[PDB]
Design a binder for this molecule. Structure first.
Ligand SMILES: CCCCCCCC/C=C/CCCCCCCC(=O)OC[C@H](COP(=O)(O)OCCN)OC(=O)CCCCCCC/C=C/CCCCCCCC
Ligand SMILES: CCCCCCCCCCCCO[C@@H]1O[C@H](CO)[C@@H](O[C@H]2O[C@H](CO)[C@@H](O)[C@H](O)[C@H]2O)[C@H](O)[C@H]1O
Length: 485
């Protein structure tokens, strides 16, 4: 009853519809396309242009500040951009089908790049719309319903699309149908609620760029929260990186069985776990849910440790995969809720995109290290290390209880006034490190244009990441000292 009420309310359907519209764009630019172009034997000539469509989704934060300042002529900051980024995908996705892959491959690639760029903006504005309107109690269930819509969109965009195209309809008509299925999405955008008009908006574009950073870094506890955001998901990334390879080699299973088992059980478990986490969060506070969910996520992948020693069996694999996926989808909703709470209403999506990118910066480094650890200590000890690698996230969450308990009851963050002498040094060092990484990115994009070549590529990135880590460590230590005193 009280746990059930959330589903009947009409805004839930709008959230799901707007979620499915994010998926239909993701697979009509990289995956169904190649399947279409396999008739024309996609070459290496167009990959130079085609390298950007995958890249728009990773680098969305840089063009994000433009979204908050600007507004469409009518409809307010967050319900006008969704009408503008859901009318452009429709004019391009259908048209793209008008082209012929015989002699217009470059035009097709350029249209794919434009479609990806539009989808990135729609995604960021939709995240801002989610964070602005949703109240304090229902955030987890909203995130779960959005994830369910996302998955139901990706599945329709790939599977049923391929089946229809190669059975009845044809490729051009499959593209036409994937274009025409966006009309309900724009209807839902038009009929959805809006953020209030009380909240102020930045007056200058440079102000839009600079204000969110000064607002987030002028908090009582900022560096500790940054460290928690970075280090929450390590214990899941480590196991998810090589679970498939372990199930292939260390146990003795076949590729098809592993693929099928993942492709069904992982989806079902993730969906059920996310919805359960949202329903339970609807009545439970943020900190207790975060702690319990983190402990469960850390203790989940001991099933893999049990599997590694014991001999092969189908049901053991099924149970372990089901449990791991349920615990992961269970904690992902709590993490999304924690990300959503911190940002303030006025500058929402810039502070959401930067935090989301900082969340995913963890997966880049763990990859090669996961490779080295296996040859060092066998398959089995790797998973014990995975179990023990979730301790820092729980410890940081335990230390940072005060701010999360105060925010729920006061709905605002206390400004920083303790130890004002040492924060400037850390901020300046972090700025210098980010500037160094920007210089490295400029060097990489200068080299990739074949205008010139540089021999200083990896060392600059290593130095910059070392400087950034040192700055964040100094900030965290100073914050801990201030909290103790
Ligand atoms: C409804 C609103 C929609 C808003 C967005 C619409 C965008 C439509 C079209 C945009 C085309 C943008 C072209 C930019 C060209 C200049 C930049 C460039 O060439 O960067 C290259 C460089 C490296 O590319 P490769 O060499 O292929 O990488 C190889 C890696 N191994 O690119 C990158 O590093 C990342 C990609 C670019 C990220 C975004 C750059 C900034 C934004 C550009 C366009 C968005 C609008 C900006 C202006 C807004 C105000 C008018
Ligand atoms: C200094 C700023 C922060 C660091 C910037 C450089 C590192 C960026 C993070 C590491 C690279 C991976 O970055 C991450 O890529 C995945 C790729 O699917 C993106 O994935 C995204 O997929 C779709 C895109 O519409 C979203 O619905 C989803 O929520 C999101 O995760 C993330 O938005 C991005 O953050």
């Amino acid at each position: 009853s009280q746990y059930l009420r959330i589903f009947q309310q009409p805004r839930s359907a709008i959230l799901l519809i707007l979620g499915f519209a994010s998926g239909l764009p993701l697979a009509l630019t990289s995956g169904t396309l190649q399947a279409w172009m396999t008739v024309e034997n996609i070459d290496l000539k167009t990959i130079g242009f085609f390298s950007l469509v995958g890249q728009a989704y990773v680098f969305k934060f840089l063009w994000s500040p433009l979204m908050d300042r600007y507004t469409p002529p009518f409809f307010g900051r967050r319900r006008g951009w969704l009408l503008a980024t859901q009318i452009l995908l429709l004019v391009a996705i259908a048209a793209m089908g008008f082209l012929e892959p015989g002699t217009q491959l470059r035009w097709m690639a350029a249209l794919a790049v434009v479609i990806a760029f539009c989808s990135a903006s729609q995604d960021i504005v939709f995240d801002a719309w989610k964070t602005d309107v949703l109240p304090a109690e229902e955030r987890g269930a909203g995130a779960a319903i959005s994830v369910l819509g996302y998955r139901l969109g990706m599945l329709v965009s790939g599977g049923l699309a391929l089946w229809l195209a190669d059975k009845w309809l044809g490729w051009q008509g499959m593209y036409w149908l994937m274009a025409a299925l966006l009309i309900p999405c724009i209807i839902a955008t038009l009929l959805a609620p809006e953020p209030t008009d009380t909240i102020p908006v930045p007056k200058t574009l440079e102000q839009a760029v600079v204000a969110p950073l000064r607002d987030f870094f002028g908090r009582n506890n900022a560096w500790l929260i940054l460290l928690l955001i970075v280090l929450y998901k390590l214990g899941d990334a480590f196991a998810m990186s090589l679970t498939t390879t372990f199930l292939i080699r260390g146990v003795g299973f076949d590729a098809g069985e592993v693929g099928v088992v993942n492709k069904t059980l992982g989806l079902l478990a993730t969906i059920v776990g996310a919805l359960y986490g949202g329903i339970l969060m609807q009545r439970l506070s943020l900190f207790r849910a975060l702690l319990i969910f983190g402990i469960l996520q850390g203790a989940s992948n001991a099933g893999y440790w049990l599997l590694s020693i014991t001999d092969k069996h189908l049901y053991s694999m099924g149970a372990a995969v089901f449990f791991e996926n349920l615990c992961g989808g269970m904690g992902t909703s709590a993490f999304v809720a924690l990300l959503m709470t911190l940002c303030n209403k006025s500058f929402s999506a810039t502070q959401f995109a930067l935090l989301s990118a900082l969340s995913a910066v963890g997966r880049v480094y763990v990859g090669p290290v996961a490779g080295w650890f296996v040859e060092a200590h066998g398959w089995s000890t790797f998973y014990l290390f995975s179990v023990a690698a979730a301790v820092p996230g729980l410890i940081l969450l335990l230390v940072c209880r005060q701010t999360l308990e105060y925010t729920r009851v006061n709905d605002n963050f206390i400004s920083r006034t303790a130890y004002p002498a040492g924060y400037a040094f850390a901020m300046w060092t972090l700025a210098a490190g980010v500037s160094l990484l920007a210089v490295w990115l400029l060097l990489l994009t200068m080299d990739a244009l074949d205008l010139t070549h540089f021999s200083f590529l990896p060392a600059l990135l290593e130095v910059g990441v070392l400087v950034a880590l040192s700055g964040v460590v100094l900030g965290g230590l100073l914050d801990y000292l201030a909290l103790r005193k």
